[PDB]
Amino acid sequence: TCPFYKKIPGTGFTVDAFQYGVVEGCTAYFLTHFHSDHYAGLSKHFTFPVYCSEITGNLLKNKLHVQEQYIHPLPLDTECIVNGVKVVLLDANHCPGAVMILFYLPNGTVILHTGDFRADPSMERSLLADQKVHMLYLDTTYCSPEYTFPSQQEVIRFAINTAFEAVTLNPHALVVCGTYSIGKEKVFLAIADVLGSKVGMSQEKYKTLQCLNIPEINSLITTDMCSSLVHLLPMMQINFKGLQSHLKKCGGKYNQILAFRPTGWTHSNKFTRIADVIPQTKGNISIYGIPYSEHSSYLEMKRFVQWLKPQKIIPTVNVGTWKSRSTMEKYFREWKLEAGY
């Protein structure tokens, strides 16, 4: 059955709760973003109302084939009414179309659900600042002090300079970026822009990108692999064997590959800075690991929560074991004692 952390008290609303069949009492199902864990169970066979951003609605319509009658897209930063209750969708700074939801309950309680988010100080000057938030449903993916990572902009700068140098040294080098879902598009778009190229990709991936309301998108991406010097492949193919194999397929138009694997955190965040990063190399193929994160680091998460000062925190990630929950509760109490709420 639907866990309590996916239910919004004193409404018949749920959030990211599509895998439990019909939820008893639920009149509106919210979807924060189009990542398979959160949408799990949604298909063309679903027949209840789904509330979401416009981008998330495009994806539901075109990729999952959910019938149009059940998709209720809402604009961002706008007070809207859903089944008699005031809501606001906010940018979550996660992947394209990802939202946080602010719920103003009839009794006067205010609840923020973050979805998946990368906390940022620009969130301290949104509609959130206008009133007290009593309960927070929090993306706790990286809720432990070891999880540090650079800014998105540091990582992009590094990727840009690396790619430009390599293709100026060898104009027959191909650049490859690994991918498995939406998110982290700035990586391949910024590399292509510095090389004066479109991004080449499969038909299914192009169809996904064509849903995301990216300005001038038709000038940036193509299905003609031949005509482009940046290619997207599945993350699973970003290894020496998969990359040599792809290079054979391109028809000797290229004689070298430089590849990037955007990952989350991995244990080499604890020593290295982004400027020290060096690739793994085998012959004419080099693979760079770059920690481009779309989740809050420990410090960004802590800052956001200490500003917000919620009366109760409800974790939404790593809640499956008591050890994890216990560990998280310890950090929440520390934050509260330091900040005086």
Interface contacts to Ni ion, rule CB under 5 A: 35, 116
Which residue number is nearest to Ni ion in terms of Cβ?
Answer: 116
Min dist CB 38 to Ni ion, Å, is 6
Q: Which is nearer to Ni ion, 225 or 314 (CB)?
A: 314
Min dist CB 2 to Ni ion, Å, is 19
Min dist CB 100 to Ni ion, Å, is 12
Place of tokens 């479109």: 198
Q: Which is nearer to Ni ion, 92 or 233 (CB)?
A: 92
Place of tokens 């020593």: 271
β-pairing, 99-104 vs 110-113, is: antiparallel
End-to-end CA distance of the chain: 34
Q: Which is nearer to Ni ion, 116 or 300 (CB)?
A: 116
Q: Are 305 and 143 in contact (CB under 8 A)?
A: no
Q: Are 200 and 227 in contact (CB under 8 A)?
A: yes
**Distances from the Cα of 305 to the Cα of 111, 246, 334, angstroms:** 13, 45, 12
Q: Which is nearer to Ni ion, 93 or 162 (CB)?
A: 93
Q: Which is nearer to Ni ion, 7 or 35 (CB)?
A: 35
Min dist CB 114 to Ni ion, Å, is 11
Min dist CB 141 to Ni ion, Å, is 9
Min dist CB 181 to Ni ion, Å, is 8
How far apart, in whole angstroms, are the C-alpha atoms of residue 269 and residue 221?
32
Q: Which is nearer to Ni ion, 38 or 261 (CB)?
A: 38
Distant-in-sequence, close-in-space partners of 90: CB < 8 Å, separation ≥ 6: 76, 77, 99, 100, 101, 102, 123, 126, 127, 128
Distant-in-sequence, close-in-space partners of 318: CB < 8 Å, separation ≥ 6: 140, 141, 143, 324, 325, 328
β-pairing, 280-282 vs 285-291, is: antiparallel
CA 299 to chain centre: 18
